Amino acid sequence: TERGPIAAHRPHEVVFGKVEGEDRGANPMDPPRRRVDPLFWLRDDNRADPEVLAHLHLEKDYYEKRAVDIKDLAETIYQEHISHIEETDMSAPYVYDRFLYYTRDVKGLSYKLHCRVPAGKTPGEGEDEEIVLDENKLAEGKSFCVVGCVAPAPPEHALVAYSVDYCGDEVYSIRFVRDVVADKVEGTNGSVVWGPNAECFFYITKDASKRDNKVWRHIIGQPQSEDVCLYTDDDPLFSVGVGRSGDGKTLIICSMSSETSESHLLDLRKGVKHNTLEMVRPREKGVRYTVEMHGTDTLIVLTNKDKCVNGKVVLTKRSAPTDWGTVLIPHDDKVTIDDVAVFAKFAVLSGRRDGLTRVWTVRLGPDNLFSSATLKELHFDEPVFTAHVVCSQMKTYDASLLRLRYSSMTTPTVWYDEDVLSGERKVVKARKVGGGFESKNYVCRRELATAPDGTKVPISLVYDTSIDLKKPNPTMLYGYGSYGICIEPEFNSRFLPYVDRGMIYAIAHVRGGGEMGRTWYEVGGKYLTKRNTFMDFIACAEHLISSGLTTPAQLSCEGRSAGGLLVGAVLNMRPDLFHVALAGVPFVDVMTTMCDPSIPLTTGEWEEWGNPNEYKFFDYMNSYSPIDNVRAQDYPHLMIQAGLHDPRVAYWEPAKWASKLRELKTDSNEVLLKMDLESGHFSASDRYKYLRENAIQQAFVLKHLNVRQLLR
């Protein structure tokens, strides 16, 4: 009896293929195809059409009427999110020459404070603390302000450089902490790399389309007009970067594209007038590499070369740097190596293996050469987690300690120092989580689903340890995965309102994401294999059901943005698997949007999903496009969040989708559309806002699953 809004049909036709005067791609169908979209009119580029507005106000009214009984729970949940944030905080301090550096956040203030304490003292507010740079002071009276970099000049740290942008154009000027020197450097990308003894520093300028194209040396006490430019790459596929070797003796200059690199070395021992670069390996298309210096004579190179898609690490001499015959760490199908950092006594590798983030360590042999047999992987007790080396906090080249960051669905982020040789760990900073959180109450684990083609898909799940595992329990299954993003099983206080009410909270690491490495995205779920994203997700839900963890009556799912594509297709395919669902700013008008280059992101996104103006993609994309596959079947309760002026998805997509669902669905569940009408074109996010949206959706799920009350 009590149906939500259904929009009147207005015949309109959408054309796919070649259209005079429009850039529809390099190979559009000729002649083109036409299909009817009777709800096309809900789109207004202007966001102001009165008939469109009257319709969305019907949606506002139906939403309000229907959220009456979840308002108080939403507010409880919001209170929970609030209590999880520490407005007063200090970061993990780290040695940097004769100081301990750290950041602080203060209760009433928007920006951080960059602080320092002498070598032997206790980090924190007090007589000992020296406030190096207070961003609130820079920010004062300004509408936009972002610091790119705070950069103390090594040995002494008497000059500290910093970069600031007050414009929002991502161009930064470089200034000095309380004008110790007068020098000012304009037109930079925000980064600052010191040369030795505070004599000079290095910076990068841009040209067309704000592309980083030149590396410069600025000598302190000189006008910028005299800066020497060391390097230029004006190939528009390439961007430049500059870094400093760990021992501080060598500058590393590089050009990078999405698939090709090139590095050059500059000797910093030769003074401010020596500008001649040393070529590492010339540019070769499809060959990626990164260079790190072990001392001054040897390079450790992480590369793609010779089909090592997952990376190999190579050891070469400065005097013959194109000879990459010596493999320190061979390629391995199982292991992904994303980077290396080198120190005097060991190198540290980062990447993934078996779906998780990993860190590896390699030491010196008894002979001062790096040694393969030394390779170890840092091990953890829990089955799913996140772990990273934090080399922004490793400022001392001859260290024995690693600085590490661990986080898990059980464990708020912990920073610790670990001994490279023994493996002894010492806590530096463990995150505080308020509102009664304690780690011992929770357990996380790994499950493996099996897709139709036989491929194993990992799931990370967490729950409160007091639930009855001898029966099935209310569950939330989250999925993204496009663009090769990994949805990490890291700590996230935002699932606590679920988990604290008896729910199992689960992530499906489906193809399209990047969790299993290189090919999990690029062959696994992209272009004409994209359907794997949805089939994998379903396989995860079925595994959770066949193993006894849940049942369809007690299962929920959610995705946001490109993850909204996932929920949309999955609800057409297997809505029987889910009692209630969420879809934030969901990408659901796939065909009608992807055909049309007038819509802002369309053109770029051809390189993700494909171009339905082309024969190659028309039917395939049409097979999963959510709006296009809505039909007369039972769907679960659903809540859609979107925004009139939100740039994550054009407002009309979720509006068309909700109208269509209500028009054809055969069930009597509710589809709610929470549509922000008030935020404007330039409105900034704001974070308390995101928590308010999170809270009402979570209240929705919790109502429908019948788990309103806290467990403890």
Author numbering: 3 to 714
Copied sentences from the primary study:
To this end, we have determined crystal structures of T. brucei OPB in the ligand-free open state and antipain-bound closed state. In this study, PISA identified two potential dimer interfaces present in the TbOPB open state structure, each involving ∼1000 Å2 of buried surface area. One interface involved contacts between the ãβ-hydrolase domain of one molecule with the β-propeller domain of the neighboring molecule, and included a disulfide bridge between Cys169 of each molecule. Without the closed state structure to compare with, it would have been easy to wrongfully assume that the lattice contact was the biological interface. With hindsight the lattice contact involving both domains and a disulfide bridge would impede the inter-domain flexibility needed to allow opening and closing of the enzyme during catalysis (discussed below), and therefore could not be the biological dimer interface. Domain separation pulls the propeller residue Glu172 out of and away from the active site. In the open state, and in the absence of Glu172, Arg650 adopts a quite different position in the active site, binding instead to the catalytic triad Asp648, which in turn displaces the catalytic triad His683 to the surface of the molecule.
Oligopeptidase B (OPB, EC 3.4.21.83), an enzyme belonging to the prolyl oligopeptidase (PREP) family, has recently emerged as a virulence factor in T. brucei and other trypanosomes, and is a potential therapeutic target. The overall structure of TbOPB comprises the typical 2 domain α/β-hydrolase and β-propeller architecture that is present in all members of the PREP family structurally characterized to date. A short N-terminal segment (residues 1–87) and long C-terminal segment (residues 436–714) together form the α/β-hydrolase domain, whilst the region in between (residues 88–435) forms the β-propeller domain.
